[PDB]
């Protein structure tokens, strides 16, 4: 019944928890608050896999 | 064979999905006990859910009739299920864990869920079927 | 008209009527002079400050101005003779209780009211168009120059 | 003799059905309470383990062994270990059983309660024998073994009452009902449209006439004619459970009288 | 054990509300299984 | 903060709490093991020389017993390893550290302990088993339940604090809290539910049960009250027996909606000389409400008498409910067919009305409300219409519920539940809102990948047309889950925010105290208020009263 | 706890002859308060009990999947076909006296699970024990015979109660307590006291006759010494300089 | 002791309300046109219907010979004689209000363990009713 | 809004009145506009009240805001508790916050 | 562990008596009897039989705490009748009724054939 | 001694406060527990606290409460002369 | 792990009916309801004891003994 999917490090069963991150190589436009000289910004976190 | 299709959130934006094929797909007295279902009267469906119950996870799939419960209660149970004594594995005798709890007489629930068939809950149940009475007997 | 006040005069009257078994039919032996003087002298015994100078005496009078209004309204000549039908023995009993009850309700020196006030205001906060609830309490306890939803009420 | 009257409807080795009439509710309730919690019975109390290679823990086996029902027909001839003058246990207050099972066969071998062997001097009594109440002749499935697994242990059985531990309870569920027609108005029936239609009729309703359908409420009536069905786990005959249940209740009341007399003397 | 092996984490300067159950989560993460503490909403289950 | 303002202390214990209906208000059940470990140093005196000597003989392995003996020179003898020299002869001025016994005053606390009533002094009661035990009536000041909560216990080690704890922190003295000049303790849960049923006009008790119920009140004079009905069968009313627990000389009058002297609905309250004349006893009377029985009794007879009232009412009511019983099941959440048909049409009519406003809005003929946009005005109209539909449907379901409905009974007595609970459980869950607004379009122009783009119908934007009994559809289930997640997030964040606010307030006002000149001053002596509360009274002694002169017309004033 | 968010701790244990019983003699293995149902609105708890009752009677496995055609009325019809009340109510008898309960009890099987939290692993008490090496206060942890924190919030409540002596007792006698010698010229704890020889000296002040002893928490002594290392000199004086 | 009030009333109507054992009945005196009675009766033990004539009597004590928590109530013994023997329904309660309805009309309120009664009539017919305990005796 | 004002007979009778609710606060300028009742104008931000009417006016406004928040949820707290907190916040001639930049900047001993 | 031994429910301990009769000062000719190591089985039965006595005035019993197996019985009788004698009579009535019940059951059982 | 207000000009309340009663009872209870001469007849009492309560009721506690003022001045009030009404 | 000896609710001996229950299901092709009634388990407290039991001892027996004689 054991499903596996984990590692045994120094005799301890360790499971890698999936990490959530924002997708790269996507254009996103955001609005900024009043106390700033900038109204809109389009930011892309260019990434090559 | 082109009978099922993998779809992600990005592709979810440009498709129409029917919750069930029983009523939404066919072109279009009622039992008063049955819940009110919306047909949505759409004739351009592109996909169909395998089953709505699959939205839940491993912990929430053990809850019986989770749609008849208030949402906060369902969340709380998911946390407590992981804290219930049972049979985590059948080889606990040969394993040497820091702490382990094993129930003498685990029992499968009388009222179970189909999703529980694939979680091996019947083979490794965590709990017992107890005759419970809801009464104000002694105030304890 | 309903406001919190120290002594429950209504309960005292009820106790007097039942304790002495007021006939409710035979006329009482109270006199108009006794009732007026009785209530007037009772107001003097309601002591919160016991200084013997003008400043403290002025504060003492102000501290019981609202209570005396309740006292005079309840213990009126017609009300005592007509509504309550109190007897002379009952009337004296009622006055003594008000004096005793009032003196017991005075704040005990050494009370940590500041902690009491803070806890009394804090505990309700845990149970919580315009900002309200905890966010507004944060905006009030912290003196924020710019608040979320300023508003002006004009009559 | 003109007191509590009895009438037996169904009599069986495991179940006895009777009607208790001309008796008070307090007396009837005490009878079932005594029949459940105060009838002495023989059961395994202490287990000595010398070899346990099984997949089950020693405490797991010991708990199951205590629950095994043992014959207690001559239990009264046995003495409480607390009231006996012996170091640990003797033949006057205990019955010793031995269990020896080995996995000599390739297929799984089952250890039943019939494998328990008494190694004590019964002195002609009729107690200690495990109860066999099935067709195949086996008893309760105590444990299972595979090749190379051995189970050697010695059991000591002492008398006790279910109050100390439920394993000494000689009676299973006991049915207890009265006034099936609710003529005494001891229950307010929950209902949605019609209480009579929404509540099934008790089987005992056939033994009592229905309400006259319009007669005034009888405020002078008191509960009587109780219907009881006593079930036995097999340790003692079901009839003896009722007979011994009455005797135990009789003894308890007699003890109060004896204690009351004692204080008068002193 | 099964729930732990299918858990996901979201590291919380950001201008958004990641703790809430978004509509896009439908059929992708369990809407009920989440910690009741500071990790509420941040830790999701497939 | 971690070592000076607050520090770990000795002579303390922790364990789970449980409810004991058979324990006094000021009593706390203490496990035997905890009692043996905890000790109190008692100075040897001629009055206790015999008692203390016996404890030393018992030793530290038998409660009651002792663990140490301290001589006048400061030398401490451990009774373990000390029996080798036979018995020890005590002398005046010595100290014997002995196990805490019954009636000993101890401090009983639950964290976070946000207010003073969260730390109150109880009387020790050594009991079997591994858990603490306390009265049900004292749970509310502690904000504690028996789902697994653990609470702390502290044992004073000196006569100065022993007397201080019992004279200032005793539970009976905290009945009337000064926070809101009203009682903080009252009858609740099972006892509150039973008292409402017991005091009904239809509740009559026969002789056999009355005698047992009378004997259950410890302070019963031994006089059997005359039954309300003498013939043709002696019967006692529930009000009559409950009146035995109420001390004599207590007067209480309250008028509810439509209440009169001949209370037709048996509402209101009227107690004369401790005897209940009419009115069903419920939360408004025996609850922690202003002007109730508890508030009147404590102010009239004293805190000790009020404490006895809690036990007497609990004991008599608990015994009665034990032999009567109360339950609840699925059948209590089911409304008859005619009611469901009315509920269904109520929602259908509301949906049609929502459609009507939608069509005109799409036609552009709808004019936005002043100070609002077209869409916000349209949303307000839809939300109000749907909220009223749930309320109207809930009223229809509630009205249909019979007096024998268990859920309705609890709501009427105020023990648990409310109108909204019945409506959602039986009639309609209602609209689900996130951030105070309808379900937003997480996807592009829609809420879920099951509707069409630009859909504003009640079903699309998260209106749960079903009830919990009938179940929720998959779309409704997700939307309902979304609303719940908002509450869970709010609960977690609000707890942290409120805790910091509470700490800040206390630290700002921790040094303010009322001095012997009635002035309120801080540590520096600076005057905050020249008289506390501007009147100089204590909040615990304030009651709401009506000024008869301010109100009324001029003609009434003269008359 | 059950599978619906309902968790609780055992209040008391009763034997079979004390628990309430039905006409068939069945006694409950567990009893829960009705008051938990209304506010929490866990209808599934009642539906499961009704479904489980039918499943046990019929020897089947109930279908408790969320979105299906199963309804309470459908389950009720099956239950009534088995000779039981449709909504699951049963007539029970008081175990103490044997009399019928005026009310009928929702009676049926339900699935329950034992949680990891047991009182035997949480109960602990301390009268005296080991102290931390640094602060000389009760150690932390039940497994190490540690104490229980008397935090700042607890201090505030005692301040509100006015128990000044009790607050000192908790913070001094029930926790770290230390006696130090201070110089009357300088309020520093720099006095070398030869208690055996009854000699005191504050080198740097050239005095041996102006020494005082003060009872302060060991944490307070640690704080001032730490401030001393930071070049801040806290001077503890036993008499007022400025007028009150 | 002695009868404080005695009269014959005709039950105008009976209102069960929300109670299954207690009914409130409105009745008027047969001999006096200014006397009416409002009473709560445990119909489970003494059923009352419309158009019924009831003899209502109020007495200070049940013992026959005059003798003007008092005493511990005791179960009736064999051979006990009291006013209750001549009637069918007997109640014991306490008066708690006297109201002036008109110039000569006086209303007296009674409570028999929660069951309320109101007896209104001329000042010269209810003068004997005092603010104390009384027995209400009713005979069909 | 509905306000109870004494009737010519002498009783209290509720009559409707027209009130203007505004977004944004300009207390000094708005107060001078003709046609309004300057003796009844109220401002949500007690900061503007303090700098326009006075500390005592700010104290009354500060108490009103605190009372509304506590009473918004329906909970009731005795008057003296609210007054003491408000008085502390205005005992130095200005609105001192309950943060580290307010009461913690006073002269009350370093240890405190 | 703080679980009391199960035999403490019925076994009389050291320095403990089955009965403890004390006079009730609140009412005349009334006594309180404390039964040790007993429960509702005898309290209900004894109390019910006492209520059948015409000379008995008040009969009530209570178990103050389920933890301890002891209940208190309060008996008040008419003047000249000893409450202890009332307890004697009630216990004798129970024994006689139980004895008849045992004889009746045995005779009826002997007539049955299936068992 | 300018900080000792004369008995003729005392302005504090003549009633004992709850804190004063609590400390007086505790203060005398400790003395009783340390073998102090009890000035009240005992009809049978072993708890020092109960003995102190008996002494307070009959006004046999030889202590005076020094009530301090915010400026440092104090007033001495004997327990016997203080009214115990709370 | 193995069939309980007694019924929890009432104490009826059900540990001697596991093999009979399995035989009825397999050889006789009987449904669970009929098999339980055939075995004499009428109260649903007894029925759930045998109906809901999970036999984990068989799974454990697959592992070889730790110590062989
Ligand atoms: Mg909790
Ligand atoms: Zn022996
Ligand atoms: Zn120096
Ligand atoms: Zn069973």
From Swiss-Prot, chain D:
Which parts pass through the membrane? none
* GO MF, one annotated term: metal ion binding
The entry marks the following residues as binding Zn(2+), namely: 84, 86, 90, 93
Chief localisation class:
nucleus
What does the protein in this record do? DNA-dependent RNA polymerase catalyzes the transcription of DNA into RNA using the four ribonucleoside triphosphates as substrates. Component of RNA polymerase II which synthesizes mRNA precursors and many functional non-coding RNAs. Pol II is the central component of the basal RNA polymerase II transcription machinery. It is composed of mobile elements that move relative to each other. RPB3 is part of the core element with the central large cleft and the clamp element that moves to open and close the cleft. Seems to be involved in transcription termination.
Question: So what family is this one in?
Answer: Belongs to the archaeal Rpo3/eukaryotic RPB3 RNA polymerase subunit family.
Q: How does it assemble?
A: Component of the RNA polymerase II (Pol II) complex consisting of 12 subunits.
Tell me more from the record: Present with 10000 molecules/cell in log phase SD medium.
Q: What name does UniProt use for this protein?
A: DNA-directed RNA polymerase II subunit RPB3
Gene (UniProt):
RPB3
Span within the full-length protein is 4 to 268 of 318
Curated annotation (Swiss-Prot), chain E:
Taxonomically, which superkingdom? Eukaryota
Q: Where in the cell?
A: Nucleus
Assembly and interaction partners: Component of the RNA polymerase II (Pol II) complex consisting of 12 subunits.
Role according to the record: DNA-dependent RNA polymerase catalyzes the transcription of DNA into RNA using the four ribonucleoside triphosphates as substrates. Second largest component of RNA polymerases II which synthesizes mRNA precursors and many functional non-coding RNAs. Proposed to contribute to the polymerase catalytic activity and forms the polymerase active center together with the largest subunit. Pol II is the central component of the basal RNA polymerase II transcription machinery.
> What family does the entry list?
Belongs to the RNA polymerase beta chain family.
- Further remark: The binding of ribonucleoside triphosphate to the RNA polymerase II transcribing complex probably involves a two-step mechanism. The initial binding seems to occur at the entry (E) site and involves a magnesium ion coordinated by three conserved aspartate residues of the two largest RNA Pol II subunits.
Query: Any idea what this protein is called?
Result: DNA-directed RNA polymerase II subunit RPB2
Q: Which residues of the full protein are shown?
A: 491 to 539 of 1224
UniProtKB/Swiss-Prot annotation, chain I:
User: Please, what other remarks does the record include?
Assistant: Mutagenesis experiments demonstrate that the minimum viable CTD contains eight consensus Y-S-P-T-S-P-[A-S-N-G] heptapeptide repeats. Identical and simultaneous substitutions in a number of consecutive repeats are lethal: 'Ser-2' -> 'Ala-2' (14 repeats), 'Ser-5' -> 'Ala-5' (15 repeats), '2-Ser-Pro-Thr-Ser-5'-> '2-Ala-Pro-Thr-Ala-5' (10 repeats), 'Ser-2'-> 'Glu-2' (15 repeats), 'Ser-5' -> 'Glu-5' (12 repeats), '2-Ser-Pro-3' -> '2-Pro-Ser-3' (15 repeats) and 'Tyr-1' -> 'Phe-1' (12 repeats). The binding of ribonucleoside triphosphate to the RNA polymerase II transcribing complex probably involves a two-step mechanism. The initial binding seems to occur at the entry (E) site and involves a magnesium ion temporarily coordinated by three conserved aspartate residues of the two largest RNA Pol II subunits. The ribonucleoside triphosphate is transferred by a rotation to the nucleotide addition (A) site for pairing with the template DNA. The catalytic A site involves three conserved aspartate residues of the RNA Pol II largest subunit which permanently coordinate a second magnesium ion.
Name of the molecule in the record: DNA-directed RNA polymerase II subunit RPB1
**Where would I find the Glycyl lysine isopeptide (Lys-Gly) (interchain with G-Cter in ubiquitin) crosslink on this chain?**
64
At the highest ranks, the source species' classification is: Eukaryota, Fungi, Dikarya, Ascomycota, Saccharomycotina
Location(s) in or outside the cell? Nucleus
Name the source's superkingdom: Eukaryota
Leader sequence segment: none
Positions of disulphide bridges? none
Q: Which gene encodes it?
A: RPO21
Swiss-Prot record, chain K:
Q: What is one GO cellular-component annotation here?
A: nucleoplasm
Q: Which UniProt keywords apply?
A: Cytoplasm, DNA-directed RNA polymerase, Nucleus, Phosphoprotein, Ribosome biogenesis, Transcription
Q: Which GO terms describe its molecular function?
A: DNA binding; DNA-directed RNA polymerase activity
Task: Name any Gene Ontology BP term.
Answer: transcription by RNA polymerase II
From the record, what ranges are coiled-coil? Answer: none
Keyword Hydrolase included in the entry's annotation = no
Where in or outside the cell is it found? Cytoplasm; Nucleus
The membrane-spanning stretches of this chain are none
Keyword Transmembrane among UniProt keywords: no
Q: Which domain of life is it from?
A: Eukaryota
Q: Return the annotated region ranges for Leucine-zipper.
A: 42-63
Give the UniProt family note: Belongs to the archaeal Rpo6/eukaryotic RPB6 RNA polymerase subunit family.
| Role description | DNA-dependent RNA polymerases catalyze the transcription of DNA into RNA using the four ribonucleoside triphosphates as substrates. Common component of RNA polymerases I, II and III which synthesize ribosomal RNA precursors, mRNA precursors and many functional non-coding RNAs, and small RNAs, such as 5S rRNA and tRNAs, respectively. Pol II is the central component of the basal RNA polymerase II transcription machinery. RNA polymerases are composed of mobile elements that move relative to each other.
Q: What else is known?
A: Present with 6090 molecules/cell in log phase SD medium.
- The entry's protein name is DNA-directed RNA polymerases I, II, and III subunit RPABC2
Protein species of origin = Saccharomyces cerevisiae (strain ATCC 204508 / S288c)
């Amino acid at each position: 019944f054991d499903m596996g999917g984990y590692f045994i490090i120094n005799g301890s069963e360790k499971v890698l928890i999936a990490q959530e991150r924002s997708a790269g190589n996507i254009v996103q436009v955001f609005k900024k608050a009043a106390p700033s000289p900038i109204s809109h910004v389009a930011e892309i976190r260019s990434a090559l896999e | 064979e082109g009978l099922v299709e993998y779809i992600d959130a990005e592709e979810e934006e440009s498709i129409l999905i029917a919750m069930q094929p029983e009523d939404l797909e066919p072109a279009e007295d009622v039992d008063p006990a049955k819940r009110i279902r919306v047909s949505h009267h759409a004739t351009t469906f592109t996909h169909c859910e395998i089953h709505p119950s699959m939205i839940l996870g491993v912990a929430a799939s053990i809850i019986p009739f989770p749609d008849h419960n208030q949402s906060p209660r369902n969340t709380y149970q998911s946390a407590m299920g992981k804290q219930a004594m049972g049979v985590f594995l059948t080889n606990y005798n040969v394993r040497m864990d820091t702490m382990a709890n094993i129930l003498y007489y685990p029992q499968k629930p009388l009222g179970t869920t189909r999703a529980m068939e694939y979680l091996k809950f019947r083979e490794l149940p965590a709990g017992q079927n107890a005759i419970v009475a809801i009464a104000c007997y002694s105030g304890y | 008209a309903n406001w919190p006040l120290p002594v429950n005069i209504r309960r005292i009257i009820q106790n007097a009527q039942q304790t002495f078994h007021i006939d409710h039919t035979k006329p009482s032996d109270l006199t108009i002079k006794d009732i007026v003087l009785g209530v007037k002298d009772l107001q003097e015994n309601l002591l919160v400050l016991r200084g013997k100078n003008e400043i403290i005496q002025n504060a003492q009078r102000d501290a019981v101005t609202l209570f005396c209004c309740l006292l005079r309204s309840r213990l009126a000549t017609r009300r005592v003779l007509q509504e309550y039908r109190l007897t002379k023995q009952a009337f004296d009993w009622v006055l003594s209780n008000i004096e005793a009850q009032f003196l017991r309700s005075v704040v005990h020196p050494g009370e940590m009211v500041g902690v009491l006030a803070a806890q009394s205001i804090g505990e309700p906060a845990t149970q919580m168009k315009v900002t309200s609830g905890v966010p507004r309490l944060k905006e009030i306890l912290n003196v924020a120059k710019n608040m979320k939803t300023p508003s002006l009420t004009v009559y | 003799s003109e007191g509590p009257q009895v009438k037996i409807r169904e009599a069986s080795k495991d179940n006895v059905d009777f009607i208790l009439s001309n008796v008070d509710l307090a007396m009837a309730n005490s009878l079932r309470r005594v029949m459940i919690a105060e009838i002495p019975t023989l059961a395994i109390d202490s287990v000595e383990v010398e070899t346990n290679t099984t997949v089950l823990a020693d405490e797991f086996i010991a708990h199951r062994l205590g629950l095994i029902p043992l014959q207690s027909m001559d239990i009264e001839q046995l003495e409480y270990s607390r009231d006996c003058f012996c170091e640990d246990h003797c033949d006057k207050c205990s019955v010793v059983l031995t269990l020896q099972a080995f996995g000599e066969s390739e297929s799984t071998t089952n250890v039943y309660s019939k494998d328990l062997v008494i190694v004590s001097n019964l002195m002609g009594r009729n107690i200690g024998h495990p109860i066999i109440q099935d067709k195949e002749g086996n008893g309760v499935l105590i444990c299972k073994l595979r090749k190379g697994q051995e189970l050697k242990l010695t059991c000591v059985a002492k008398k006790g009452i279910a109050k100390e531990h439920a394993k000494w309870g000689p009676a299973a569920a006991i049915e207890f009902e009265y006034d099936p027609w609710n003529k005494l108005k001891h229950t307010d029936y929950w209902y949605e449209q019609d209480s009579a239609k929404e509540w099934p009729q008790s089987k005992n309703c056939e033994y009592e006439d229905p309400p006259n359908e319009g007669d005034p409420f009888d405020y002078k009536a008191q509960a009587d004619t109780f219907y009881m069905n006593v079930e036995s786990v097999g340790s003692i005959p079901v009839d003896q459970v009722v007979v011994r249940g009455i005797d135990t209740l009789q003894k308890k009341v007699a003890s109060i009288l004896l204690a009351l007399t004692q204080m008068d003397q002193d | 054990t099964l729930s732990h092996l299918r858990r996901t984490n979201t590291p919380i300067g950001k201008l958004a509300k990641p703790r809430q159950l978004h509509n896009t989560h439908w059929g992708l993460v369990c809407p009920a299984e989440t910690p009741e503490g500071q990790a509420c909403g941040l830790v999701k289950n497939l | 903060r971690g070592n000076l303002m607050g520090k770990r202390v000795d002579f303390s214990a922790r364990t789970v709490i449980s409810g004991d209906p058979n324990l006094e208000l000021d009593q706390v059940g203490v496990p035997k093991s905890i009692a043996k470990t905890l000790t109190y140093p008692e100075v040897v005196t001629p009055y206790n020389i015999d008692r203390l000597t016996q404890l030393v003989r018992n030793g530290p392995n038998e409660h009651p017993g002792a663990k140490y003996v301290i001589r006048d020179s400061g030398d401490r003898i451990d009774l373990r390893y000390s029996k080798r020299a036979g018995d020890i002869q005590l002398q005046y001025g010595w100290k014997v550290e002995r196990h805490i016994m019954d009636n000993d005053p101890v401090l009983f606390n639950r964290q976070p302990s946000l207010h003073k009533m969260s730390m109150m002094a109880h009387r020790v009661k050594v009991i079997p088993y591994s858990t603490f035990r306390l009265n049900l009536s004292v749970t509310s000041p502690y904000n504690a339940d028996f789902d697994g909560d653990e609470m702390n216990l502290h044992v004073p080690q000196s006569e100065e604090t022993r007397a201080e704890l019992s004279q200032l922190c005793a539970v009976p003295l905290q009945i009337v809290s000064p926070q809101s000049n009203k009682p903080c303790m009252g009858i609740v849960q099972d006892t509150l539910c039973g008292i409402r049923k017991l005091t009904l006009r239809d509740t009559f008790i026969e002789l056999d049960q009355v005698l047992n119920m009378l004997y259950w009140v410890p302070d019963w004079d031994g006089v059997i009250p005359t039954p309300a009905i003498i013939k043709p069968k002696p019967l006692w009313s529930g009000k009559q027996i409950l009146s035995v627990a109420i001390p004599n000389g207590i007067h209480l009058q309250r008028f509810d909606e439509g209440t009169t002297l001949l209370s037709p609905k048996d509402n209101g309250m009227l107690i004369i000389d401790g005897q209940i004349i009419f009115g069903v006893v419920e939360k408004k009377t025996v609850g922690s409400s202003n002007g109730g029985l508890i508030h009147v009794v404590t102010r009239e007879k004293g805190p000790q008498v009020c404490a006895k009232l809690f036990g007497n009412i609990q004991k008599v009511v608990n015994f009665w409910l034990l032999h009567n019983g109360f339950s609840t099941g699925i059948g209590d959440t089911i409304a008859d067919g005619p009611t469901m048909r009315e509920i269904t049409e109520t929602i259908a009519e509301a949906k049609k009305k929502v459609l009507d406003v939608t069509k005109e809005a799409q036609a552009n003929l709808l004019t936005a409300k002043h100070g609002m946009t077209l869409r916000e005005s349209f949303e307000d109209n839809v939300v109000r219409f749907l909220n009223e539909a749930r309320d109207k449907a809930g009223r229809l379901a509630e009205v249909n519920l019979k007096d024998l409905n268990n859920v309705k009974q609890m709501v009427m007595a105020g023990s648990k539940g409310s109108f909204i609970n019945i409506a959602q459980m039986s009639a309609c869950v209602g609209q689900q809102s996130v951030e105070g607004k309808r379900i937003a379009f997480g996807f592009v122009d829609r809420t879920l990948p099951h509707f069409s783009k630009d859909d504003y119908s009640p079903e699309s934007k998260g209106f749960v047309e079903n009830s919990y009994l009938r179940g929720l559809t998959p779309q409704e289930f997700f939307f309902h889950a979304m609303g719940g997640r908002e509450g869970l997030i709010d609960t977690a964040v609000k707890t942290a925010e409120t805790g910091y606010i509470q700490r800040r307030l206390v630290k700002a006002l921790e040094d303010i105290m009322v001095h012997y000149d009635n002035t309120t001053r801080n540590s520096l002596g600076n005057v905050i208020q020249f008289i506390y509360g501007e009147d100089g009274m204590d909040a615990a002694h304030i009651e709401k009263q009506s000024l008869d002169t301010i109100g009324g017309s001029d003609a009434a004033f003269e008359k | 706890a059950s599978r619906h968010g309902q968790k609780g701790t055992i209040g008391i244990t009763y034997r079979r002859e004390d628990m309430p019983f039905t006409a068939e003699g069945i006694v409950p293995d567990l009893i829960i308060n009705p008051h938990a149902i209304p506010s929490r609105m866990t209808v599934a708890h009642l539906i499961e009990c009704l479904l489980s009752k039918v499943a046990a009677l019929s020897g089947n496995e109930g279908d408790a999947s969320p979105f299906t055609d199963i309804t309470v009325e459908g389950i009720s019809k099956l239950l009534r076909e088995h000779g039981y009340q449709s909504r699951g109510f049963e007539v029970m008898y008081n175990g103490h006296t044997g009399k019928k309960l005026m009310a009928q009890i929702f009676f049926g099987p339900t699935y329950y699970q034992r949680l990891r939290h047991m009182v035997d692993d949480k109960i602990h008490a301390r009268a005296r024990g080991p102290m931390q090496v640094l602060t000389r206060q009760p150690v932390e942890g039940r497994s190490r015979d540690g104490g229980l924190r008397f935090g700042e919030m607890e201090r505030d409540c005692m301040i509100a109660h006015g128990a000044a002596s009790f607050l000192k007792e908790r913070l001094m006698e029930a926790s770290d307590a230390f006696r130090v010698h201070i110089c009357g010229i300088c309020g520093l704890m720099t006095v070398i006291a030869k208690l055996n020889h009854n000699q005191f000296e504050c080198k740097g002040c050239d005095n041996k006759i102006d020494i005082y002893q003060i009872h302060i928490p060991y944490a307070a002594k640690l704080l001032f010494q730490e401030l001393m290392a930071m070049n801040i000199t806290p001077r503890l004086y036993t008499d007022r300089s400025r007028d009150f | 002791s002695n009868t404080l009030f005695d009269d014959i009333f005709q039950v105008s109507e009976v209102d069960p309300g929300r109670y299954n054992k207690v009914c409130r009945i409105e009745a008027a005196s047969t001999t006096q046109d200014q006397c009416k009675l409002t009473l709560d009766i445990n119909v489970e033990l003494f059923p009352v219907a419309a158009q019924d004539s009831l003899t209502v009597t109020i007495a200070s004590s049940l013992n026959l010979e005059d003798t003007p928590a008092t005493r511990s109530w005791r179960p009736p013994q064999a051979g006990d004689r009291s006013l209750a023997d001549d009637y069918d329904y007997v109640m014991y309660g306490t008066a708690y209000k006297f109201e002036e309805v008109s110039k000569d009309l006086i209303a007296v309120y009674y409570s028999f363990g929660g069951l309320l009664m109101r007896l209104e009539g001329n000042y010269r017919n209810l003068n004997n009713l005092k603010q104390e305990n009384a027995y209400l005796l009713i005979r069909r | 809004y509905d306000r109870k004002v004494p009737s010519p007979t002498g009783e209290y009778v509720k009559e409707p009145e027209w009130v203007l609710e505004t977004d944004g606060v300009n207390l000094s300028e708005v107060m001078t506009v003709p046609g309004i009742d300057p003796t009844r104008i109220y401002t949500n931000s007690f900061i503007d009240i303090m700098e326009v009417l006075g500390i005592e006016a700010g104290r009354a406004a500060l108490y009103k805001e605190v009372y509304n928040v506590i009473a918004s949820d329906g909970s009731y707290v005795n008057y003296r508790h609210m007054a003491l907190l408000v008085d502390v916040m205005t005992t130095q001639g200005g609105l001192t916050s309950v943060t580290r930049h307010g009461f913690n900047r006073s002269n009350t001993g370093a240890l405190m | 562990m703080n679980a009391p031994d199960r035999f403490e429910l019925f076994l009389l301990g050291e320095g403990e008596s089955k009965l403890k009769i004390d006079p009730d000062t609140k009412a005349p000719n009334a006594v309180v009897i404390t039964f040790e190591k007993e429960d509702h089985t005898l309290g209900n039965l004894i109390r019910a039989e006492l209520l059948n006595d015409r000379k008995v005035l008040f009969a009530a019993y209570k178990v103050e705490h389920p933890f301890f197996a002891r209940f208190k019985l309060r008996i008040q009788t008419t003047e000249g009748y000893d409450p202890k004698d009332a307890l004697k009579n009630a216990c004798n009535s129970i024994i006689n009724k139980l004895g008849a019940l045992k004889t009746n059951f045995e005779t009826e059982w002997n007539l049955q054939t299936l068992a | 001694k300018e900080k000792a207000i004369p008995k003729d000009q005392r302005a504090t309340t003549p009633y004992m406060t709850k804190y004063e009663r609590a400390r007086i009872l505790g203060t005398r209870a400790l003395q009783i527990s340390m073998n102090a001469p009890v000035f009240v007849d005992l009809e049978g009492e072993t708890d020092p606290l109960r003995i102190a309560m008996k002494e307070l009721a009959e006004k046999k506690i030889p202590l005076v409460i020094r009530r301090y003022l915010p400026d440092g001045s104090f007033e001495d009030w004997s327990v016997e002369e203080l009214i115990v009404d709370l | 792990m193995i069939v309980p000896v007694r019924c929890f609710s009432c104490g009826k001996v059900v540990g001697d009916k596991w093999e009979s229950y399995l035989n009825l299901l397999q050889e006789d092709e009987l449904d669970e309801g009929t098999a339980l009634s055939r075995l004499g388990l009428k109260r649903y407290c007894c029925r759930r004891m045998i109906l809901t039991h999970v036999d984990l001892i068989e799974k454990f027996l697959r592992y070889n003994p730790l110590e062989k004689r």
